[PDB]
Amino acid sequence: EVQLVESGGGLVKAGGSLILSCGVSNFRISAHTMNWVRRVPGGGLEWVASISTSSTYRDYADAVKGRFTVSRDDLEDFVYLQMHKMRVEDTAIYYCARKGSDRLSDNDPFDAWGPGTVVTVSPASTKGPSVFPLAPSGTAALGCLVKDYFPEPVTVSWNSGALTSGVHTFPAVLQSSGLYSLSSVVTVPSSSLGTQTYICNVNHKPSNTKVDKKVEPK
């Protein structure tokens, strides 16, 4: 028996990027042309890429040609597949199989395969923010809490740029959900809380989302 061991596969977002790799055991890849194959949710096998012995010639299936790059390491026995700007239909199990035979030739089938690794390309390429008020309970503090937006960045202004003094817009934090969240605050005179209107202008160019939120006492 001989073995191949795919790694790196998981959840992805459309127009995002991932890299797969395949290790091996009981054999050396330095003799073999190495191939990537996938099984789509529709159940059919698609060939994806190959790279020759001696790393000479690299070839691709026409759905991934130009978008993907195949790579190899003949010494530690690893193969790689960069997947730049993935499509929703790049969702598949991705297998790494060796072109091979007991005696090798200038043309053979795939005589050993690894168990395959799942890749899912979720269709949400950009997510637009939610915006929530940070309500002011001398000097008072108020703000806006931008949340659940992808990718960065978000820009925030206050009163269309007329209110700049005392404003702090914080660096975003990356949540364990894979989505970003930032807060923008401003300190102002407590006396102005009844008359002055405070509006934070949240712009998210990647989703083409604009939100104007008025922040007022509860």
Partner: protein
Amino acid sequence: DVVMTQSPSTLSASVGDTITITCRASQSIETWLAWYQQKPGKAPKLLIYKASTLKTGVPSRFSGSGSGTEFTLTISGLQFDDFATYHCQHYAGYSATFGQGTRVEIKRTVAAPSVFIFPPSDEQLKSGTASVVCLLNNFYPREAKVQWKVDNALQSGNSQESVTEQDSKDSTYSLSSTLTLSKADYEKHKVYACEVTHQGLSSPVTKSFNRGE
């Protein structure tokens, strides 16, 4: 460039049946075909490394043929082990292409789905998530369609389906579909229904419930 025209897309049979499958190249190749088995979610296994040319260690029940354009695979009395997918491959020096695999499956008469709908448990709902489940308990063949409607509004994009492979005692398929909604959105509507079509049904089947009733 070559495309493989494998036929049928699904073959129905049973233990001890001799079966034949056929891959037809869209333009001629020099007998560069090979054939694989694939069990669900597994790696494929190579059976035949050139047309009619069986790989060593492969069970003797397997066979095939090739004519430079038309090709076959054949199994000499199926075992319960053989009820998996089969794929043809055309392999060139630095590329390959495969047939849309012939799924081999255990045959029976057509059977319509028993449909059941489950509301979210109160215990799930208090946590803030509502998962509504639709069960097609047993049917044959595999191909069925389920759609969700909330307040008679056809839903789109908020459900995930999985099918169990053939049952060990009756060889039917079964499907379940999970409609996912936050507690907020779920309490916004009353009726939650699933509508089913299948080979055995003369009209769509709908199961529904009213939230809170």
